[PDB]
From a paper:
Owing to multiple mutations to the spike protein, including in the receptor-binding domain (RBD) and N-terminal domain, Omicron BA.1 infection can result in substantial NAb evasion. We expressed and purified the prefusion-stabilized trimeric ectodomains of BA.1, BA.2, BA.3, BA.2.12.1, BA.2.13 and BA.4/BA.5 spike (S-trimer). We determined the cryo-electron microscopy (cryo-EM) structures of these S-trimers at overall resolutions of 3.1–3.5 Å.
All the S-trimers contain Gly-Ser-Ala-Ser (GSAS) and 6P mutations along with the T4 fibritin trimerization domain for increased stability. By contrast, BA.1, BA.3 and BA.4/BA.5 spike possess relatively tight inter-subunit organization with more buried areas between S2 subunits. However, a local conformational perturbation surrounding spike residues 444–448 disrupted the hydrophilic interaction between BA.3 spike (S446) with hACE2 Q42, presumably owing to the single mutation G446S rather than double mutations of G446S and G496S. Group D antibodies were most affected by the G446S mutation in BA.1, BA.1.1 and BA.3; these NAbs therefore show higher potency against BA.2.
Residue numbers in the entry:
A (entry chain A): 1031 to 1127
B (entry chain C): 738 to 828, 849 to 1079
C (entry chain B): 738 to 786
D (entry chain B): 982 to 1030
E (entry chain A): 300 to 677, 689 to 737
F (entry chain C): 29 to 68, 71 to 142, 146 to 210, 212 to 299
The structure:
Amino acid sequence: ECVLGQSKRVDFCGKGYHLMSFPQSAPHGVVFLHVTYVPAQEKNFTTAPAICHDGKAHFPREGVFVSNGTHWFVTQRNFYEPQIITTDNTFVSGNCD
Amino acid sequence: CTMYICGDSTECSNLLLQYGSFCTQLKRALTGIAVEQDKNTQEVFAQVKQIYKTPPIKYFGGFNFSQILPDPSKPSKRSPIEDLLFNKVTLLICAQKFNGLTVLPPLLTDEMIAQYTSALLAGTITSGWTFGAGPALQIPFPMQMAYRFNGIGVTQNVLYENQKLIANQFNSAIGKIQDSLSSTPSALGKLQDVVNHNAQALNTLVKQLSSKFGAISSVLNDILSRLDPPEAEVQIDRLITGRLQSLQTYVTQQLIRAAEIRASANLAATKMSECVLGQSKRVDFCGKGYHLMSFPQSAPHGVVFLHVTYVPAQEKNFTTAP
Amino acid sequence: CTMYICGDSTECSNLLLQYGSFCTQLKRALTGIAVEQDKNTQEVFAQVK
Amino acid sequence: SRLDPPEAEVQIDRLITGRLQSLQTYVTQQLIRAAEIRASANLAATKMS
Amino acid sequence: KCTLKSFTVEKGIYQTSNFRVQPTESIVRFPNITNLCPFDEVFNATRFASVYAWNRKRISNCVADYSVLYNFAPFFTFKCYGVSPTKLNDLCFTNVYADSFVIRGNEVRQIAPGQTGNIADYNYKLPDDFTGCVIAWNSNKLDSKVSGNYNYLYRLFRKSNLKPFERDISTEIYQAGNKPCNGVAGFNCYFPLRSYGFRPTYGVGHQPYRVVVLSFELLHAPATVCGPKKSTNLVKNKCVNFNFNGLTGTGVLTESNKKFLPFQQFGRDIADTTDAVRDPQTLEILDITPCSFGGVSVITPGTNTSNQVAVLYQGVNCTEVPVAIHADQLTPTWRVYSTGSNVFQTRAGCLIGAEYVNNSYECDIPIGAGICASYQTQSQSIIAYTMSLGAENSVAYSNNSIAIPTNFTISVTTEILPVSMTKTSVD
Amino acid sequence: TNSFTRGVYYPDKVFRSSVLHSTQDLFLPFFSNVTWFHVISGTNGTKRFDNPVLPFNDGVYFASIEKSNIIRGWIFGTTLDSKTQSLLIVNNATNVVIKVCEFQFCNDPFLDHKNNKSWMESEFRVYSSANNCTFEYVSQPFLMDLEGKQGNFKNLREFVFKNIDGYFKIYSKHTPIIVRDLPQGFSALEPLVDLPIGINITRFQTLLALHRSYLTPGDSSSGWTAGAAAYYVGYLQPRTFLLKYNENGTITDAVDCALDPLSET
Ligand SMILES: *[C@@H]1O[C@H](CO)[C@@H](O[C@@H]2O[C@H](CO)[C@@H](O)[C@H](O)[C@H]2NC(C)=O)[C@H](O)[C@H]1NC(C)=O
Ligand SMILES: *[C@@H]1O[C@H](CO)[C@@H](O[C@@H]2O[C@H](CO)[C@@H](O)[C@H](O)[C@H]2NC(C)=O)[C@H](O)[C@H]1NC(C)=O
Ligand SMILES: *[C@@H]1O[C@H](CO)[C@@H](O[C@@H]2O[C@H](CO)[C@@H](O)[C@H](O)[C@H]2NC(C)=O)[C@H](O)[C@H]1NC(C)=O
Ligand SMILES: *[C@@H]1O[C@H](CO)[C@@H](O)[C@H](O)[C@H]1NC(C)=O
Ligand SMILES: *[C@@H]1O[C@H](CO)[C@@H](O)[C@H](O)[C@H]1NC(C)=O
Ligand SMILES: *[C@@H]1O[C@H](CO)[C@@H](O)[C@H](O)[C@H]1NC(C)=O
Ligand SMILES: *[C@@H]1O[C@H](CO)[C@@H](O)[C@H](O)[C@H]1NC(C)=O
Ligand SMILES: *[C@@H]1O[C@H](CO)[C@@H](O)[C@H](O)[C@H]1NC(C)=O
Ligand SMILES: *[C@@H]1O[C@H](CO)[C@@H](O)[C@H](O)[C@H]1NC(C)=O
Ligand SMILES: *[C@@H]1O[C@H](CO)[C@@H](O)[C@H](O)[C@H]1NC(C)=O
Ligand SMILES: *[C@@H]1O[C@H](CO)[C@@H](O)[C@H](O)[C@H]1NC(C)=O
């Protein structure tokens, strides 16, 4: 699992988000080198579940609505890459009430 | 050995020492079993680097969490679910304390086990799955539930307009689960079974002293007052062989049971790592239906998982095209 | 035990029962093995409702 | 048919110790094999699920 | 380091021995009777009995001196299937039966439970399980007389094999069955009760032997035969080496709230040992329980670092037991480890030589019940702090704020798994 | 009738509390038939053969229901004569004598009186001609009586006689509750003394006299007709009884392992 592919099981191939693994020969056993993705230097913001624009509710396709305190952006979850809220990033479903 | 096989008699101890290193093996096996049990509890429970504390304001978008969060009013900081689990498992007794069958206390008492479960619950209720990969990143609970909905296929807007219904369903299920535990007579079959097996093994080992094994009497001290030591040592050897065989049988049965409990604890640790610290896409691993999130709960000699799953209902058939 | 160890001899069983409960343990272990095999089959196959 | 009961009981004890030891060896070997089969059946149930 | 059979010990907690407290007294509770048993009247008779009709003499309520036996009828065999030749004067006997009879020269060893035939099925029969001994000696002239004393009548055969310890004073007219008969005539109506009798110079094997069995029994009713009485006064709150009518044990005598019936004597438990006994005098029921029990485990930081150790007495209250040393009674010895440092009362047991600081660290040596041990300062000694679960943290939760990481770290960890061990083959 | 739940005693004189200990000594089987053996003796001079011969199949259970001192003694022997030493028991008003000796025929005095002789006397002399007689048991009597109030108050006596490797034992207890046909009251039974004679017994006899015969019917019908006629006689068999003690140390209940498959469970 951890070597021949990428595992989505949490804490099965090391603490964090698993990327790959390395086999290492050992006497009477084996040794794995688990390369993991550990986030750091978090910044907190103000978030909203949806945005009403013209009487309709907007939800992001992939990502979460984020704000810098004045206006709102959209960005992916595990990294801070803010972007302008367009109709490509979000989708419309239902009213905003 | 020198106190179970021989009732504090020095001549029986001199006869027992002649058998060699047969009894250091049993003590080393029992110490290995005890160390393995402590290691099992440590790997199932101690997985979070930091203890997380829930905020005093317990509002999570309408989701009731009083049944699984700890209650400060109780003398032991335990949830009502944990309290009911502790009251549904029951652990003379002085005979095993009198012929050497001692019971060692575990390294982790129930208070810090409950603290570990509380920290895990606070982490999975506040930081989502982010605290199981690195630093704890806070997130509103409706947003975390929306992303857990997105993880199984259904989009987040379904939760975002059915939040009240979903919260009411969750509260109804978590309220019914306690009465389901109370009404079921054999709900905690495994946790009662392990302690019953240990008690029966100890009772059998204590009761095995009453056998004669070919000797004229079962009591050791009655032998010395009736026979010469050339034949008293023969009767003593006859008793020692049977008592040592009974001890060896008890040790190997305990070793097999310890291996089975170790496998169960490894499975429990894997379930704690996957269903609780994140979201598992494995089918029928964290309950029937599409898994959303799980809750660990402390228990006597074990752990209890509360698996919250997504079960579709009210289906309708239509006509389709590829 | 009383049928395998002793070939239906009465006082052989009398000397056998003097050894204690060395055979009830074997009987309960074998019944536990049989129950575990039945549980294994039920867990593998009976998974649909 | 050959020995007096004071020494016939010694011969019965000699036979019984070996027979009981053989039965105990059989039951612990079966316990180990049943544990391995239980692990294999748990793997099979996981693959079914 | 004696228990691990090495000179260097690694850091850890080790089970070493068990704390056991020896008693200081050996009080005996033999019953109060000063009579003398009748073996002189048993052995110094003129005519003892016949083989089929042996006397049954009850011996009870007397002090029996089993040392002086060879001064009456020497050259015995003593044939003891039970209590040893030198051990009958140690334990109490409920009933002693002296049965004396004569058999010629061949069944003085066929009186054993194993042997059977024309005597064990038609005369004195010993049961298959039997405790007791028999005395046999020469009767070449003192019980031979002129042409026999004619008291050699033996049952020869009868219809059924008789039960052990059973006699039959009757005559038979046995036939084996053809035209059934009751007459004295010999042919097809053969008469039982043959005998011996001869001049003392005879064919060696017929020369008689006076055999006097001695069957005993224990347990049962309150004992009557006691042997040499060495009664000692009572103590009811300390460990002693008591001796109650035969049993010897080490334990603390203790008063009872029991409901022993007057006929009941001993008190057993789930094991074979006895936990309650009745004294022969004053009829007082006393409970038996041993002294302090638990094992001792030694906690060390390793001889590579230091030599101080802290011992833990498993499963005993620290504020009551140890503390008082009372030397020359503790089998583990090394009694210097009772007031060397301060104590603590743990659920695991009493901890000797470890000072309880109440800081919290990730612990080093697991002791039990949430308490660990290490070798640190407050100057380098052994401390007994409580386990720490980790850093206390409180991430702020609000229903409008989220946290998003602006950076990451590529972290590489190791994991070690055994795969295959050594392969071994034995011949 | 059927002996429902009586006949359990103490196999050893050992105090056990709240133990489920098992044993091997012989008992009376549960739910087993017994004998009525009614004695009429209407003081009319006639005889009805009310003291038959019992084969003594390894132990006898004896249960009697009298007023104060109606029954007296039992006779044990092989040929019921002076060829073998036969055990004889005689009960007095303030004493009991238990003695085995070669006795030919147990006598019976002139007993033809019902109500005119309210004061009972001119009795005993049951014993036969004297011979080489052994050590007796002149001691305190075991039968006791309680003053019955408002009727229906009589004491039932349960006696167990057995022989193990010749040794002779007695088990006796008195239950003063009701006067019915072997009620379901479970109670233990206490041994008193051990008789060390070690002689064989093949036949059993009793020595009941009926100077007072109040409300005693008589019928020659033989069949399964349950009723408290005069007393009960039971037979012991080698069983594997399991006994339960309580906190105070009394046998509250007991079952065997050969009556029912539920008993085997
Ligand atoms: C949040 O980020 C935005 C965009 O990166 C920043 O806002 C800019 O602020 C500067 C300073 O006056 C202006 O000149 C720009 O026009 C702003 N850009 C936008 C898109 O508004 C700023 O870093 C944050 N905004 C805050 C704190 O209000
Ligand atoms: C979560 O549910 C529990 C029980 O379903 C609620 O506890 C009740 O609280 C009210 C007042 O606070 C009491 O009158 C009831 O007696 C409680 N129920 C029980 C069974 O004790 C709790 O209030 C709910 N939480 C929220 C936030 O509403
Ligand atoms: C989907 O199922 C839920 C669960 O049954 C339905 O919610 C229930 O609706 C009925 C009828 O209005 C109410 O009486 C219940 O109180 C509701 N239950 C809860 C927990 O709120 C819901 O109506 C269903 N959806 C549709 C469109 O019918
Ligand atoms: C971020 O969190 C810190 C403490 O964790 C808090 O002081 C700060 O106000 C938070 N920032 C925002 C924008 O909420
Ligand atoms: C849906 O299934 C039912 C039977 O379960 C069937 O009768 C019905 O015709 C189906 N509907 C359609 C639109 O095919
Ligand atoms: C024997 O012992 C006591 C004290 O030694 C003595 O006074 C008494 O006469 C006897 N007691 C009994 C119960 O026989
Ligand atoms: C003892 O400690 C030294 C370092 O102080 C080091 O060689 C090793 O850890 C230990 N060596 C031996 C031989 O125990
Ligand atoms: C002392 O400890 C023992 C060990 O369990 C316990 O039984 C006893 O009750 C304790 N006594 C006190 C006064 O704490
Ligand atoms: C100091 O140690 C004692 C040990 O009994 C403990 O009860 C107390 O709580 C500790 N102090 C603090 C502040 O934890
Ligand atoms: C958010 O949480 C607060 C409590 O901190 C609560 O009073 C409020 O109703 C919640 N919802 C909002 C602000 O929409
Ligand atoms: C045990 O005896 C006591 C005597 O004080 C009595 O009160 C209690 O009821 C008895 N219990 C039983 C179960 O016989």
